[PDB]
Design a protein around this ligand. Structure first.
Ligand code: MUZ
Ligand code: NAG
Ligand code: NA
Ligand code: NA
Lengths: 250, 11, 28
């Protein structure tokens, strides 16, 4: 996260770290949506242009963390993966369309003060909140700038951007399964996700029921926190029928 | 860079 | 989950975090 701040303890208890077993390294963020299911970006697991194709046994998820590098004894919980599900129409060839994946844990994780699932949006909450100018929150342990790495989980609040401005900021073909967020050059304030934040959550706190909803997944961006560029996020509600189909079937 | 995690998780 | 999105250390004890008000103020 660029130009963010240290998270408070328990501020993002759905935050998940995707962790490579060997070598031991941060791969991506992710989020907890139930005691057995973790949501992330498909390109965190599958991206042939970079020879990336992780299997279940390659990975762990670490839940309840605050410190990036410490083993947080008695606080974090480490879970093995039972199965990875990637969206069948994830477009890694062109523009990361439908950049979404689910991971089923081998065993349910115990909830605690530090471990708790986020909600997924309904149609009405999505329609109400996914509006230009409305702010969401992005969290992660990724790099602090484009060109270093944080001691603890970082957090930044960022406004959703009008779709024409998102499109006009890039040569990539944008789809309805994406939205973009960030400040404009003329708005003064700054902030963005960066390398290592992919797969983590863009959340909003509903003013109707005071619950946190995951509206986006950190997906892609051109550099980090560049003037006139924006971060792009997987549109969770638009892909929710696939999410539910996977959970209902497996 | 990262602190070693308990061996039980790497089996 | 019935309790999704309600954080044990914040919503569940009616404590606010230091910047959630910035989000609320943007929901105009
Ligand atoms: P995310 O953190 O994933 C990641 C990357 C490297 C190590 C660990 C995790 C990262 N996402 C990406 O890098 C995606 C994955 C394919 C390439 N990519 C890009 O963001 C890329 C643009 C895409 C657009 C669609 C077609 C394929 C290219 N741009 S980049 O390479 O400049 C991103 C980047 C990588 C490394 C260092 C800096 C930037 C990611 C997500 C979001 C942001 C952001 N909001 N600025 C940045 C990086
Ligand atoms: C990814 O790996 C799996 C198993 O390792 C394989 O079945 C699949 O064909 C691979 N896909 C790509 C695009 O390499
Ligand atoms: Na364009
Ligand atoms: Na920018």
């Amino acid at each position: 996260i660029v130009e963010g701040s240290d998270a408070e303890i328990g501020m993002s208890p759905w935050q998940v770290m995707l962790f490579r077993k060997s070598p031991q390294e941060l791969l991506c963020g992710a989020s907890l949506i139930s005691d057995r299911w973790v949501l992330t970006a498909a390109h965190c697991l599958l991206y042939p242009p970079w020879d990336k194709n992780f299997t279940e046994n390659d990975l762990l998820v670490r839940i309840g963390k605050h410190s990036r590098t410490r083993y947080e004894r008695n606080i974090e919980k480490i879970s093995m993966l039972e199965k990875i599900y990637i969206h069948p129409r994830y477009n890694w060839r062109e523009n990361l369309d439908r950049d979404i994946a689910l991971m089923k844990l081998k065993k349910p994780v115990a909830f605690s003060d530090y471990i708790h699932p986020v909600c997924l949006p309904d149609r009405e909450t999505a329609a109400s909140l996914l509006q230009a100018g409305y702010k969401g929150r992005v969290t992660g342990w990724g790099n602090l700038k484009e060109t270093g790495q944080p001691s603890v989980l970082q957090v930044v609040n960022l406004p959703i951007v009008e779709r024409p401005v998102c499109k006009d900021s890039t040569r990539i073909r944008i789809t309805d399964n994406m939205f973009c967020a960030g400040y404009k050059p003329d708005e003064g304030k700054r902030g963005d996700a960066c390398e290592g934040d992919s797969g983590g959550p863009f959340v909003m706190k509903s003013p109707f029921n005071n619950r946190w909803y995951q509206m986006g997944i950190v997906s892609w961006g051109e550099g980090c926190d560049r003037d006139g560029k924006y971060g792009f996020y997987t549109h969770v509600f638009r892909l929710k029928k696939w999410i539910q189909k996977v959970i209902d079937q497996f | 860079d990262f602190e070693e995690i308990p061996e039980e998780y790497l089996q | 989950e019935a309790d999704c999105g309600l954080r044990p250390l914040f919503e569940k004890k009616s404590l606010e975090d230091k910047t959630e008000r910035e989000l609320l103020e943007s929901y105009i």
